[PDB]
């Protein structure tokens, strides 16, 4: 039972990423980083990336997390905002605290790869 299956699988991931961007694009800490971003593209890459990371099918063909955030010099408060918004998204979707924590603990290992790049 992967975290991906525990979340609800493909249909849950497809609903979670656009809901998570609705919250991120309203969050003053981070919304502006996406000002010039093609959000259809980003939603597709990030859905593939989180599906792969959480134990679903691995079809992620994009950049690693250092290259993806290169030149942004991202700060700790920006990564905390992303995790808070992903957690709030999964809660709103009906995922249990225990599963949200499993998912955040996997994604948290990427923090050192993207901060300050
Ligand atoms: C730390 C706060 C973060 C901010 C502000 C942020 C912002 C961004 C931006 C602005 C881009 C795209 C540059 C462009 O193509 O338009 C991007 C790419 C990406 N980010 Fe983040 N990101 C953050 C954290 C994360 C996290 C935690 C993950 C996943 C766990 C993630 C996964 C990705 C992926 C998969 C891409 C696309 C790479 C590709 O297109 O090859 N990001 N991010």
Overview of the molecule:
- This protein has one domain: Globin-like.
- It contains 7 helices and no strands.
- It is mostly helical.
- The N and C termini lie far apart (34 Å).
- Bound molecules: protoporphyrin IX containing FE.
- The site of protoporphyrin IX containing FE (HEM) has 18 residues, from helix 3 and helix 5.
The CATH superfamily is identified as: Globins
CATH T-level topology: Globin-like
Second CATH tier, the architecture: Orthogonal Bundle
Radius of gyration: 13 Å
- Helix and strand run: HHHHHHH
The percent range for helix content is 55-70%
PDB class: oxygen binding
Keywords: 2/2 fold hemoglobin, nitric oxide detoxification, oxygen binding
Assembly: monomeric
Entry title: Crystal structure of truncated hemoglobin from Tetrahymena pyriformis, Q50E mutant, Fe(III) form
Q: Can you give keywords for this protein?
A:
mainly alpha, Globin-like, 7 helices, 62% helix, binds protoporphyrin IX containing FE, oxygen binding, 2/2 fold hemoglobin, nitric oxide detoxification
Topology, please?
Blueprint: H1 3-7, H2 9-24, H3 39-53, H4 65-68, H5 76-92, H6 97-108, H7 111-114
Helix pairs in contact: 2-3, 2-5, 5-6
The structure holds protoporphyrin IX containing FE.
